Design a protein around this ligand. Structure first.
Ligand SMILES: [Mg+2]
Ligand SMILES: [Mg+2]
Ligand SMILES: [Mg+2]
Ligand SMILES: [Mg+2]
Ligand SMILES: [Mg+2]
Ligand SMILES: [Mg+2]
Lengths: 98, 169, 200, 178
RNA sequence: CCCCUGAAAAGAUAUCGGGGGUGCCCAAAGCUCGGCUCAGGCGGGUCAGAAAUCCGCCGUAGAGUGUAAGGGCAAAAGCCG
């Protein structure tokens, strides 16, 4: 039977947490202020799944283009196609590697 | 039952989650530990013999049962139930399947050939690795010849080559 | 505690000081917080900006600071709460803070509570704090008229109970029935001290 | 012999034992009007407004559903507790079984029908009612486990024990404990 | 169409492959605010009992969350108002 494609269709491992990470996450990711040109890493937080980007963007590095209210507009790539991810900071981490 | 060569080799993943398997057969081995099992009396025994697998493969439940019967009967007769401890060390967790046309086993089983080929349960086997202990004996050094004979008889019932290792406890 | 699968809550949660569900909603504002906390004897008012490595307190004071303006009322009543907000408000304004959001932690937002008196004092110093119009205590309570009325009734009913329940008031030389008069004196001294500072 | 002077004082001023509260309960099965009579009895017995207690689950064999009131209980404090407690002890006869004491300083005893209490009258309207009277004893510092902010555990030495509970009922309340 | 597995730690991935589910239901089972803590166990308590309401202690979730499966959730995403 063909693969089904719901928005979260092969995400058991990705959305699972170890026992020591159970419960609410810390709030420091909320407090980073990103400006255009900043580099961020998409690190999905499973306790806020409805605002999380698609599983294909986990671990990708994007560039902040701007803000939309409280979300950040991030320019990234899936293979060769440019993608625009709009997401809240709880699903973002600063990329220190350049 | 098919010849045991049909299920000897490890050809796929283990099939053991009985909550997903309809009609998984019940284990037909009544006991796994024979002789004197209480830990206090086993302290008298000072020797250990092991029937060790030489190859990887699957041992059917009925072969383990046949091996258990011949060895335990021999030890009971010649050594005495108070003078040895014999343990069948592996459990037949893996469920075997067969693709045969049958009635009273589901509608898909009525389609002939390789259409809907996933088999219905046919038995159980233990998946073993090289060096794995199949049978484990604790005995007194005076009975070494008898214990080796009992394990030689057990080996003749098993689908893979084995070897007997004798060591002190 | 018992076993490796036990998840120990956050340190501030198991101490019972931080409500992290409410704190998250405060941080989403991205505005400075007016933190107001109540102790048995004092009140604390802080203007705080949240940073990823830890909060930064722009201005923090408790009600001990009121002795620097010759306050002789109780340390943490409604009147003292208002004066604390005024001092914090002017100090916060001198540092560039124009707007703040009230943060009461685990205290209840009962109307007329002392937390909203600190807020009222902060508002009058020029720092805007959004609020509803039915929680600030009445000006009579801020002036301590509820304290003075209680003591006056106590004196004419049981003069000894007046002496015990306000022993520290008598020691300081300010009888409780004269609190509204003194509160205006202290409030004037605080306001004049900072408008002049702001002017210079 | 009032609430503030009913205190068992040991050799430390802050380790005193007093009646923290007295709770009176009546467990009626289903009815509202049946409950209403029991609710009226408690108001006139104790002088305090009783609170309706709703069923926690739906028990078919008892004919109760979750959320409907099947209970009436009132908690008594300070002076209303001491006054009613004295009456309740008399209805039993200043006798409490030793086994009725728990290890944590709670004492509960039953009243089969409320007429043995002084000051009440056999009334064919309210009927006949039973009662559960629970008394709690506490040393100072119990607020540490009950306050909203910075809640923590009370130290073991500051907790009321079974022995301190029986002594309070014998030495302070003058009750025969058996 | 949807979930887990197959699927080989980025992504994609088939078979008349395996285990299931969907063509609804709910004016609340939807929104928000506040309070509270669940399953279960123990001690005491009038009928009363394994199980009703009451007092206390323990209780990492062993409960609940309409509905498959997987994931999430404890001053809550559960329960009550
Ligand atoms: Mg496809
Ligand atoms: Mg939604
Ligand atoms: Mg294969
Ligand atoms: Mg993959
Ligand atoms: Mg749904
Ligand atoms: Mg809520």
């Amino acid at each position: 039977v063909k693969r089904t494609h719901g928005y979260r269709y092969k995400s058991r491992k990705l959305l699972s947490k170890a026992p020591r990470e159970r419960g609410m996450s810390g709030l420091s990711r909320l407090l980073y202020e990103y400006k255009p040109g900043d580099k961020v890493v998409i690190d999905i937080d499973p306790t806020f799944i409805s605002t999380a980007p698609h599983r294909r963007y986990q671990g990708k590095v994007g560039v902040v283009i701007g803000t939309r209210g409280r979300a950040y507009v991030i320019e990234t790539y899936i293979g060769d196609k440019k993608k625009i991810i709009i997401t809240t900071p709880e699903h973002l981490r600063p990329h220190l590697g350049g | 039952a098919r010849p045991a060569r049909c299920y000897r080799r490890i050809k796929g993943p283990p099939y053991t989650r009985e909550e997903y398997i309809h009609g998984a057969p019940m284990i037909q081995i009544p006991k796994f530990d024979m002789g004197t099992t209480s830990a206090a009396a086993r302290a008298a025994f000072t020797m250990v013999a092991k029937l060790v697998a030489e190859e990887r493969g699957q041992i059917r439940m009925q072969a383990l049962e046949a091996a258990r019967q011949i060895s335990s009967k021999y030890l009971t007769k010649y050594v005495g139930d108070a003078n040895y401890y014999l343990r069948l060390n592996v459990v037949p967790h893996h469920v075997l399947r067969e693709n045969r046309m049958l009635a009273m086993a589901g509608a898909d089983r009525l389609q002939e050939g390789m259409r809907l080929a996933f088999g219905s349960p046919a038995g159980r086997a233990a998946r073993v690795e090289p060096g794995q202990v199949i049978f484990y004996v604790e005995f007194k050094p005076e009975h070494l010849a008898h214990v080796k004979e009992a394990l030689r008889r057990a080996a003749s019932k098993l689908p893979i080559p084995t070897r007997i290792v004798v060591e002190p406890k | 505690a018992r076993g490796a699968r036990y998840k120990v809550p956050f340190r501030r949660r198991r101490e019972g000081v931080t409500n992290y569900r409410k704190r998250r909603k405060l941080l989403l504002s991205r505005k400075p917080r007016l933190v107001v906390r109540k102790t048995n004897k004092h009140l604390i008012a802080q203007i705080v900006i949240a940073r990823p490595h830890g909060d930064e307190t722009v201005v923090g004071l408790d009600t001990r600071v009121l002795s620097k303006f010759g306050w002789k009322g109780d340390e943490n009543n409604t009147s003292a709460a208002y004066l604390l907000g005024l001092i914090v408000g002017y100090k916060a304004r001198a540092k560039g803070i124009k707007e703040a959001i009230l943060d009461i932690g685990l205290h209840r937002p009962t109307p007329g509570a002392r937390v909203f008196a600190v807020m009222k004092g902060v508002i009058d110093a020029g720092v805007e704090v959004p609020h509803g119009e039915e929680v600030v205590p009445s000006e009579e309570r801020i002036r301590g008229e509820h304290v003075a009325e209680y003591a006056k009734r106590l004196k004419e009913e049981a003069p000894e109970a007046y002496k015990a329940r306000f022993s520290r008031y008598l020691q300081r030389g300010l009888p409780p029935e004269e609190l509204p008069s003194h509160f205006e004196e202290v409030k004037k001294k605080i306001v004049e001290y900072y408008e002049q500072k702001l002017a210079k | 012999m009032k609430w503030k002077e009913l205190v068992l004082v040991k050799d430390h001023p802050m380790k005193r034992v007093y009646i923290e509260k007295v709770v009176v309960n009546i467990g009626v099965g289903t009815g509202g009007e049946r409950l209403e009579k029991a609710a009226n009895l408690l108001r006139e017995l104790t002088g305090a407004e009783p609170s309706l207690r709703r069923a926690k689950r739906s028990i078919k064999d008892f004919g109760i559903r979750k959320g409907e009131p099947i209970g009436v209980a009132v908690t008594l404090r300070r002076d209303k507790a001491v006054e009613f407690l004295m009456r309740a002890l008399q209805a039993v006869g200043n006798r409490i079984k030793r086994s009725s004491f728990d290890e944590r300083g709670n004492v509960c005893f039953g009243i089969k029908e409320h007429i043995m209490l002084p000051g009440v009258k056999y009334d064919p309207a309210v009927g006949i009612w039973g009662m559960d009277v629970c008394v709690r004893l506490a040393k100072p510092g119990l607020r540490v486990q009950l306050r909203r902010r910075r809640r923590s555990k009370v130290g073991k030495g500051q907790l009321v024990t079974r022995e301190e509970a029986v002594e309070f009922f014998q030495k302070v309340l003058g009750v025969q404990v058996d």
